[PDB]
Symmetry: C3
C-alpha cells in the first residue's frame, strides 16, 4: 500500500514523526507489514478546494487488494481523522482517491509483485 498527501499546509506544520505515524496506522488498517508501506507527504502546495485556499488535501491510496466499499469508508475515517488531528485540515476539505492495483502492475526490486 502507498499513501500520498498533497496539501497547502506549510512544511513547519507537519509534525515530526508524521510519516512514521502514517506508516504504523496504515499497517494496522491494511494488515500489511510496515516494510511494504510507502508514504509521501507534500506540503506548501498551490491548491484550492471549492475555490478556497483554506487548508485542504488531495490524497491517494494505491494498494494491491484491501480496497473496497466498506474498507475505503474505514480508510477515509482513519485518514481524515489523522489529517484533521495532525495538520488541522477539515475532513470536508479532503479528497482521497483509492486504487486497487493488480500485482502485475506494481513494479518493485527489478520485477513486479505478480
Amino acid at each position: 500500500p502507498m499513501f500520498i498527501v498533497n496539501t497547502n499546509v506549510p512544511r513547519a506544520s507537519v509534525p515530526d514523526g508524521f510519516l512514521s505515524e502514517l506508516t504504523q496506522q496504515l499497517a494496522q488498517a491494511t494488515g500489511k507489514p510496515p516494510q511494504y508501506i510507502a508514504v509521501h507527504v507534500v506540503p506548501d502546495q498551490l491548491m484550492a478546494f471549492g475555490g478556497s485556499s483554506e487548508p485542504c488535501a488531495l490524497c491517494s491510496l494505491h494498494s494491491i487488494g484491501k480496497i473496497g466499499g466498506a474498507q475505503n469508508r474505514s480508510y477515509s475515517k482513519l485518514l481524515c481523522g489523522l489529517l484533521a488531528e495532525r495538520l488541522r485540515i477539515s475532513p470536508d476539505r479532503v479528497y482521497i482517491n483509492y486504487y486497487d492495483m493488480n500485482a502485475a502492475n506494481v513494479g518493485w526490486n527489478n520485477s513486479t509483485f505478480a
Copy 2:
C-alpha cells in the same frame, strides 16, 4: 473534478487568479458544483516532453462520471486553451490523463461518495 497541473514553467509565470479561473471553467465544463472542485498547480518542475525542456505540462483530471470520448476532447480544448493563454504552454506539449472514478473509490469527509 479534481485537476492537477505539473509544469516546468516558473511560479512567477502563473498569473494571480489562475486557481479561481480553473475552478470556474471546470465547473461549467463538467457541469459540477464549484464547491466540489479541487485544483492543484505545481510549477518549477524538472521535466521534459519529447526530450525537450521547453515549457510543457503533465496533468490529470479525476471525476466521478462526466468522463468520456467527446467530453474529454472538449475538456482538452478548454484546458490546453487555458494553459496556452495563461502559462504560455503550447497545446502539443501538454498531456492530460482523464480518470472516471467509481464513487466507492473516492474518500471525502470521513466517508466515500458511494
Copy 3:
C-alpha cells in the same frame, strides 16, 4: 508513455542528462519515438519506505498500450537499474505503478489520442 519519479534523493544528486537518459531508455523499452515521451523527476521529497527514509522512490508509468505482465517486469528491471545507477536508490526501495491508458482518456493538443 509518461514516466514520473518522486524521490527523497536531493536535487544535487540527480545527474546532468538524467531526463534525456530516461527519455531515451523509455523509447527503447516502449518502442515509442522519443518525441512522444514525457518524463518528470521530483527530488527532495518528504517520503518513507518501510518506515524509514533512506533513498527511495515512488514512480508511475502511464502508457497507451505496451503495458502487461512481461513488459512491466522488463520495465521494472530497466528503471530500477537506472534509479540504482544514477540516483543510488536500492531497487527494493522502489515502487512503480503501471497504467494502461485508453487513448480516449489521454488529452493532448486540444484533443485526445483517440
